[PDB]
């Protein structure tokens, strides 16, 4: 029991016929909203229930709404892995660039838990992989940081920047320098990631970078 309506509980312990009855003695269940201002819909994206999705998306309910923190059925989706019910979801005119009342993207949410497939999905549904979150960090910045390598690869495919900058001047290199990613830094250089970029505190990635890396990067770029 998660939700203060009956409708939004069903939905998201997964009971599609007493759900469906529900609807059929009225049909604005479908819709209205709960505490949280979350329908049926997002609980259902929440928990993966694929077939309550498909089942609401086909009676016509909106799909882009967000709750009272900004969540669209689209980032509950894509950031618990939801795979199926993204691809439902983008088939359905869900809004791929939405953003949270913390600043992210659906893609920031995959970036950051390696949900690589639906990555893949709002990519070539037209995320922007540049899109900025409050503090100006983008999906690469999430993957460099965790060490996310296929992650990058993906970004890096569908054409992510390496070098924007973050509220403290950092681009996705500085933070695999600082977090140890060795193989993320090293690609991350191969694919134009600059060295010469000074952050807030006026340190290139190589002056963030511990152990040896800093002269490895250095050679890679010149000599």
């Not at 009956?6 to 009971?15: D, P």
């Not at 690469?140 to 070098?163: E, F």
């Amino acid at each position: 029991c998660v939700s203060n309506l009956m409708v939004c509980n069903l939905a998201y312990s997964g009971k599609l016929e007493e759900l469906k009855e529900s609807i059929l003695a009225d049909k604005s269940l479908a819709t209205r909203t709960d505490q949280d201002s979350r329908t049926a819909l997002h609980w259902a994206c929440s928990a993966g229930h694929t077939e309550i999705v498909e089942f609401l998306l086909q009676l016509g309910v909106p799909v882009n709404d967000k709750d009272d923190a900004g969540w669209s059925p689209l980032h509950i989706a894509a950031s618990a892995g939801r795979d199926e019910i993204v691809k439902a979801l983008l088939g359905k005119g869900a809004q791929v660039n939405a953003v949270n009342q913390n600043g992210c993207t659906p893609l920031h949410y995959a970036a950051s838990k390696n949900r690589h497939e639906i990555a893949v999905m709002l990519l070539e549904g037209g995320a922007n992989p540049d899109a900025k979150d409050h503090y100006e960090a983008t999906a690469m910045h999430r993957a460099a940081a965790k060490g996310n390598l296929k992650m990058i690869h993906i970004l890096l495919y569908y054409k992510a920047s390496t070098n924007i900058q973050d509220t403290e001047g950092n681009t996705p290199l500085h933070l695999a320098c600082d977090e140890e990613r060795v193989e993320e830094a090293k690609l991350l250089v191969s694919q134009g990631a600059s060295i010469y970029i000074e952050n807030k505190e006026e340190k290139t990635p190589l002056q963030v970078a511990k152990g040896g890396l800093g002269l490895i990067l250095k050679r890679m770029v010149e000599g």
